[PDB]
Amino acid sequence: NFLVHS
Amino acid sequence: NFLVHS
Ligand SMILES: [Cl-]
Ligand SMILES: [Cl-]
Numbered sequence: 299n300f301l302v303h304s
Numbered sequence: 305n306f307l308v309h310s
Contacts, residue, residue: 300309 300307302305302307304305
């Protein structure tokens, strides 16, 4: 799983 | 921005 927030 | 992959 992969999650990114900016 | 938000991105999620599973
Ligand atoms: Cl992934
Ligand atoms: Cl953040």
